[PDB]
Structure formats: C-alpha cells, structure tokens
Structure 1
Amino acid sequence: PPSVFAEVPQAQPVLVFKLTADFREDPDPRKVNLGVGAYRTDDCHPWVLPVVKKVEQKIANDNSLNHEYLPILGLAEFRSCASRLALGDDSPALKEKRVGGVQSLGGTGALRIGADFLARWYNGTNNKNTPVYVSSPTWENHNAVFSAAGFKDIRSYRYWDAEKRGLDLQGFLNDLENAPEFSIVVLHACAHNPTGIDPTPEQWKQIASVMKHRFLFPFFDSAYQGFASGNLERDAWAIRYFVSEGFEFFCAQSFSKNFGLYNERVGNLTVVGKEPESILQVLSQMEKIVRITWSNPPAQGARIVASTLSNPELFEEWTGNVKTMADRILTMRSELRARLEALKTPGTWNHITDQIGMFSFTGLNPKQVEYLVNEKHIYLLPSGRINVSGLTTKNLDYVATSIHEAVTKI
C-alpha cells in the first residue's frame, strides 16, 4: 500500500464516551447524562476543590521550587504521605519499614507499573501464565491493563448478583478457592467500579482467608479513598486488614477523585512486603520499568497532595471538601431511593443506599436501559450503571419517575 498506515483501521470507540457523545447531540430538553466519569455539582458543573486552589496559589508563589527531574520513584514526601494515608499512621508495616511507594500517573499508571513488575518478577521469571482475576463487571480497563503487561490468562470472579442486587459472596469465595495457587486477584479496596456495592468487614475476612491459604496475590485498586463514604479509615479498612494478616500485596492509589486532580495524574503504587530488604529490591526494579515508560513522574499534582496531607491545617480543610462530595453523593442516593419507593416501584431498592461512592448499579436489564435512553432520554450504560453525582435536585423527580416507568413496562 502507498501509506505505511493504510492497513490500520479506526479503533473501537469506548462505549461510555459514545454515550456522552450521543447525549450532547440529543436535542431533547429533558436529557440527563448519568454516564460522566467524574464528580459534578448539583448544577452539572465540575468542582475544583478549594483546598487545591489554595495550595496551587502557594506553589505558584514559592520560588523555592525548580523544575528539575524528580526521582525515578517520584516525589519522596508524596510517596510517604500517600502510603501513610492508605495504611494509617499507626501501621505496623510502616514501623517495620517494609513499605514502598512508587509515584504513578493516577491509578492507571500504578496498575500498569504493578502488572509490568508482576509479569516479570512474580511467580517465576517472565511468567505471563499467572491467572489474573477481575470482578463480575470490573473497571473496563482492568482487563486491558493486565493484558498489556503480557498476561495471557485473565479470568473473572462472581461479584454482583443481579437478582439479589448485591454482593455474590458464595460465587466470589468459590471462584477464589478454585483459582490456581499464586494467582493475582484484582480487588476494589472501596467504591466498587462500576457496581458501587462493597464487601462488609465480615465478608472481607472470608475473602482474605481463602487468598491466604491459597497464596493468592492481592492487587488492591484504591481509587476513591475518602471520596466514597467520607471516612478515610473506613474506606481503607480492607487494605489495613490485609496488612494485619501479614499479606504481601500491591495497592494502586488514585488521587483523581478525593482531590479532584484528574488532569494532573496523581497516583501511588504502595507495596507491602515481609521484609524491608524485599521492598528495596522491588523498588529497584520499579525504577527500570518506570525509566522506559514515563522516565519520571510529573511534579505539580504530587506537590499539591504532599502539601495537603503533610500540613495539618490544609489536611482539615481537605477533609471538609471531601465530605462535601461524599455527603452530596449520599444525599442523591437516598433521595432517589425515597422517590422510587414513594411511587411504589416494584422490587427492592435498598441497594441504592447500601452501595456507596459515585457509581451505582441500578439493577435494570439492558432493555429497561434502552427505554431510559431512547424514550426518556436519560443516558446510562446498558450495564445499568449511573453516576450518582449526575443526579441533581432538578432532575431527581424526572429520573425517578422514568426508572419507575422503565420497570412498570418491560
């Protein structure tokens, strides 16, 4: 062919971006976009955290800062603060100094860096055959990230039960005890994307017990710590429980939501090891993978987080901005459930409030979604997931009535 790129086709457009594209093209005056992948205020507007705007002003006014290369592993003060946020100041793994932190480009970078390491140094030398497990519907790119690291056997475990509209613990635990030993399990630390339903502490202890005696490697995805329920301790309970149980694991931390710094790509890959020497060996090889991916991480976003977490006055204001987004999400969840039960909508709806975080599995079948999209012009994925921050005091009456209508018919 004349062009070198002639035999290359147009990539498959991701399903949620096509949803947003069709939304902004729908001329209906009652259109609702519940498929936005970020937090939106009650006025359908993005929200820059006031703590972020204040910290950014001081960074802009700080001549102590140059623009020289950060270390390969990233900004030190951000790395220690990010892992202390997930593990806690009183973590025994920190006192024993068996913790490492690689600054990442959001959670996606931490998942890629961790998967690249596992596909090279874990369960043998370049063992691409290690099974990797994901949830019923997981994050759309969990499969793609581990597939890019070379893993050739990506499996799924039961998580969300459509009929009970909740967690399928027996399907989860039986898929775990049937997994080959030393398999990697991708675990949502809190705020399950996209279901929103999380295991209880007494359910996590059962999930952890299976992975312990089968040597299943936990890979935590902590993308909404604090942002989900408004409590930093409760959102990190599963991570810290695995710490007390002596687990070795990676934990992909994201600060795009609890800080609202989506476009600055602030992430951390926390590593917990048996020995302090094992961490310096892991961080030794993380540098080689970073070097060939992004040579070193950006500084602006990580500087915002490190200043916020290490300063007690700005840490208090940040938690105030976090509870703002969590309480509004909590309010929108309860307002929708109250409206749906007031109209006498068939079926159970306590899962609307049992789930947490920004995303929620509404529990409707694909063709009930098409009614909401085509007839009522409420845009959501056929998966049945909505963005709770997409609900407002203005559209709650129209959305709740439409969901009622979608379940009346069909």
Structure 2
Amino acid sequence: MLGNLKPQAPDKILALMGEFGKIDLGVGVYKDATGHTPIMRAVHAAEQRMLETETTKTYAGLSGEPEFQKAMGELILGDGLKSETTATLATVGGTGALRQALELARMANPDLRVFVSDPTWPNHVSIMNFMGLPVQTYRYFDAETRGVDFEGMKADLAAAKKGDMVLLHGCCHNPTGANLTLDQWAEIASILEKTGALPLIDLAYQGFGDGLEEDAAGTRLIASRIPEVLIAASCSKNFGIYRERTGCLLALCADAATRELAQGAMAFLNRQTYSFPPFHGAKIVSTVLTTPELRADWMAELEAVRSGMLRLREQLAGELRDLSGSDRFGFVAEHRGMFSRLGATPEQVKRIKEEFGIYMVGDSRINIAGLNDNTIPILARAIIEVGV
C-alpha cells in the first residue's frame, strides 16, 4: 500500500539550510553577533523555576491553560481584550494556529476562498493547497519601489465577498519586510466591513518591527472595527522558543453565544488532531508574562534585539549607498522586521550563492539578523558586483 505514496515537494526555506566563509541569510530565526540563536534570559529563568514548582505532568486543558490564554490575549489586544466574546486555543506553534484557523473557517463556511498577499509566506499556500481551499492573491509588494502597492491591494480586496477570508500579516511582512501604516490599516478595515470578508491575521513577529505595542496596533485597529476576527499568534520568535512549538488561535466574536460555539469547535479541533496541545512552551510564556520581574527583562532583551537589527539595516543601507553613490537601496532601511526582498533576479540569486557563497532565499529574501559589521561590506560587494 505505502508504495503508492507520491513524492511530495519540500520546503524552499528549509531546503536552503540543508544546502548549507559561508554566510547564512535564509531561515527566519534571530541570530546574535556570534552567529548564535540564544535562549532569552527570562525564558531560562522561567524553565528553572518551572522545574522546581511543577509536581505533576498529568493531562491539562484541551484548549491550553487559562493563564496562557489570558496572557496571550492581553499581549496581543491590550485593553481591547473582551473576554466575553473571545475564544482562545493553545496550538502547536503559529503554523498549528494557522491550520486550526483554516479548519475552523471551513467548518463555518464550506465554500470559503482565501485571499493572500502577493507575495506571502510559502507555507501559507502549501497548507491551503493541502486542504484544497481556493487561493486568490491581492497585490501587495511594489517590485519597483520595494514598498507596498497599496493602490492595487485595495482594488483587489474590494473584490472579496461575504464568507471569503483575507490573510494579513499583523506586522513584519514575511518575505518582503514592506509594511502597512496605521492610516493604511484603517482603510483596509473599511474595505473589510464593506465586503463582509473575515480577516485572518498572522502575528508571528510582534516585537521585531517598531515595538511590542506598536506592532500590535494594526491588529487592534481591525479588532475594534470588525466584529469577527481570527488571529494566529506565534511565540516562536519573540520568545525565542522555536522548538517548543507554542502559539495560540484567537477567535474574536460578536456575542457570547457565538463565542461558546467557536470555543467548543476549537477544542474539538485539537481533540481530533492530537488530543492536548504541548504544555512546556506555553508555560514558559505565561510565567514570563505574569511575573513582573520576568516580563520586564524579556521586554528589555527583545528591545535590544529589535534595536540591534535596525542598526544593521541602516549600516547595510549605508554600505551600499557608498558603493554606488546612489541610494537605490534605501528601501532596506525603510523595511521593518527580519527580512527584506532585495529584488535581485533568480539568476542573480543563484550566482551570488554559487560564487560569493552567501545563501539567501530564491526570491532574494535576506535575514537581516544574519548580517554583522564584518559580513555587511562583503554582502554589499556581492550584490554590487552581481547587479545586472
């Protein structure tokens, strides 16, 4: 029987790491000056305390622990957290949240379509394909200005209708790094309510753009305007606990009734997929979040990280500027997040890795965190020499 298994397609980003003075600028993970992905001080302190307070490992909650559910809700929505109309579901990372979100939506509407940004995280499309959900794209990245073709985005979105779902990146757009402003978000919200399309927000990098609260701004705008919203958050990057697999699905509803429905459906989704969600990572998160001392050190460390990266974008931009006398590469400093699409053609991308030895995703996606003071000029030299 198993011999009938057709060969499946692998993941592009992960494939790179396998195919790796080498310079890694692929996989979206934060790395420090010494090319290491550290464990955050507070996270280490949390685990340490956990190892001393936990007396049992029995089965816990099917939708995650109340402490995790409450902390995550507050972290994301701040004061916009209306417990009476919000359903929470602890998941296996942000990807697990996205999948669960799609499963929930399809249950509610068997004939749902999904609008995704051109471009967007590859893994978004693969999952939808696997599920057999019709995917449509809305213009987003402006290839010339490397910014956002907001004009086109609004036009395409206006074509959405009731029952359809729109996937938005709350901040730090993967893979472009091009992001919407609060003014743009308000306009998107008016489009959404006019069309009746359910928004699904992918919140994977809250804290890597402009700050914890500022990065949640757009999400909070949509949440205060649209009566029904879905938010799939990840604690992988902002808490540095990638391998723990922890995230959560937030279902914002209009009334308590619908809320109890969704909460029930969500708990059922977990039960039918793997019974209980993993406890360890979720415990670290709630511990950090509910312990003043721990939250403070986490906020500080995350701040240091996001600040360092911003310095790197400006440094690289400058290097390139001086290497061409032209600030064409200025968009680099304007982008926000961990990535930036350079705009180099596929042929150039491959040429750079084969001769220069710097590995970046096929669509010219570079992980800014991968650079450093001594590798920056080298990268700049490479892009300059290759530029057709």
TM-score (norm 2): 0.96
CA distance in 1, matches of 2:15, 2:68: 36
Letter in 2 for 1:78: F
Q: Are residues 1:224 and 2:205 paired?
A: yes
1:98 is aligned, of 69, 85, 107, to 85
Do the aligned partners of 1:182 and 1:214 also contact (CA within 8 Å) in 2? Answer: no
One-letter amino acid of the counterpart of residue 15, structure 1: K
Q: Match for 1:315 among 295, 306, 327?
A: 295
Cα deviation, 1:21-58, whole Å, max 9, x if unaligned, reads 222xxxxxx32111123111111111111111111100
SS for the counterpart of 1:11 is coil
Amino acid of the structure 1 residue aligned with 2:5: V
Matched-pair contact (CA < 8 Å) for 2:42–2:298: yes
Q: Which residue of 2 aligns with 1:368?
A: 348
**Where does residue 108 of structure 1 map in the other structure?**
95
Match of 1:27 in 2: none
CA distance in 2 between counterparts of 1:112 and 1:276 reads 24
CA contact (8 A) 1:196 1:358 kept: yes
The residue identity in structure 2 corresponding to 1:318 is W
Post-superposition shift, 1:97? 2.1
SS at structure 1 position matched to 2:84: coil
Structure 1 residue 158 displacement after superposition: 0.6
Aligned to 2:3: 6
User: Which residue of 138, 152, 158 corresponds with 2:120?
Assistant: 138
Classify the secondary structure of the residue corresponding to 1:350.
helix
Q: Does 2:73 match 1:83? A: yes
1:121 to partner: Cα distance: 1.5
1:20–1:346 distance in 2 versus 1, CA, 3 Å: farther
Measured in 2, the distance between the counterparts of 1:197 and 1:70 equals 40
Whole-angstrom CA distance in 2 between matches of 1:349 and 1:381: 18
Checking the alignment, whether the CA contact within 8 Å between 2:28 and 2:338 is kept in structure 1 is no
Deviation at 1:387, TM superposition (A): 0.7
Aligned counterparts of 2:231 and 2:33: Cα–Cα separation in 1: 32
8 Å CA contact retained: 1:131, 1:180: no
Preserved contact between residue 106 and residue 256 of structure 1 (Cα < 8 Å): yes
Q: Which residue of 2 aligns with 1:57?
A: 48
Check whether the contact 1:341–1:349 (CA below 8 A) recurs between aligned residues.
yes
SS of 1:252's equivalent in the other structure is strand
Moved more, 241-250 or 100-109: 241-250
Q: What residue is the counterpart of 2:159 in the other structure?
A: 178
Unpaired runs of 5+ residues, structure 1, are 24-29
- Report the Cα distance in structure 2 between the residues aligned to 1:117 and 1:181, rounded to whole angstroms: 16
Residue 105 of structure 2 is aligned with which of 118, 131, 148?
118
- Specify the alignment match of 1:34 in structure 2: 25
Return the TM-score normalized by structure 1. 0.91
Identity %: 34
2:50 counterpart of 1:70? no
2:39–2:240 contact (8 Å) kept in structure 1: yes
Structure with bigger helix share is 2
Q: Number of residues paired by the alignment?
A: 388
Hey, what's the Cα distance between the residues in 1 that align with 2:146 and 2:128? 28
The residue number in structure 2 matching 1:168 is 149
- Structure 2: state its 5+ residue gaps: none
RMSD over aligned CA atoms reads: 1.5
- Cα distance in 1 between the residues matched to 2:327 and 2:124: 31
CA distance in 2, matches of 1:402, 1:365: 14
Query: How far has the Cα of 1:206 moved from its partner?
Result: 1.4
- The one of 313, 323, 327 equivalent to 2:307 is 327
Using the alignment, how far apart are the partners of 2:14 and 2:294 within structure 1?
35
Q: Deviations over 1:308-354 (max 9, x none)?
A: 11111111001011112211211111110010001116562222111
Alignment correspondent of 1:26: none
Q: Which amino acid aligns with 1:222?
A: L
